[PDB]
Amino acid sequence: ASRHGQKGILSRLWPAEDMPFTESGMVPDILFNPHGFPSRMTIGMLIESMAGKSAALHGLCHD
Amino acid sequence: GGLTCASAPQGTLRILEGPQQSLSGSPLQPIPASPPPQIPPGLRPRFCAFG
Numbered sequence: 761a762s763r764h765g766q767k768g769i770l771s772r773l774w775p776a777e778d779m780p781f782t783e784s785g786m787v788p789d790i791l792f793n794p795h796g797f798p799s800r801m802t803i804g805m806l807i808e809s810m811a812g813k814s815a816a817l818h819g820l821c822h823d
Numbered sequence: 824g825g826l827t828c829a830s831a832p833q834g835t836l837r838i839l840e841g842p843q844q845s846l847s848g849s850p851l852q853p854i855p856a857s858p859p860p861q862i863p864p865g866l867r868p869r870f871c872a873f874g
Contacts, residue, residue: 784872785873818863818866823860
C-alpha cells in the first residue's frame with residue numbers, strides 16, 4: 761500500500777534488466793499503473809512522489 | 824413585640840458584582856498564521872549526467 765489508500769497485490773517480480781531505466785541510470789523498484797488515479801483521485805500521491813524526489817535530491821525533508 | 828403585618832414594599836434593590844470590561848472590547852489578538860512553505864536558498868544542481 762501507499763500512504764494514500766492505494767492497496768495492491770504483487771503480481772510479478774520483474775527482472776532489473778527488463779525494468780525501464782531512466783536517463784540517470786536508475787531503474788524503479790515499484791511500477792504503478794496510472795489507471796489507479798482517475799476514479800480514485802489520489803492527487804496527493806503525485807505530490808508525494810514529487811516531494812520525495814525533491815527531498816532525496818536536495819537532502820531535505822518536506823512538510 | 825406584637826409582630827404585626829406591615830405594608831407591601833415599594834420596590835426592590837438588588838446588589839451584585841459587575842464585571843470589568845476595560846480589557847475586552849480591545850482589538851482581537853489571534854494566533855499568528857504559520858508561514859507558507861518557501862523554497863530554501865542555495866539549491867543547486869547536484870546531479871550531473873554521466874558521461
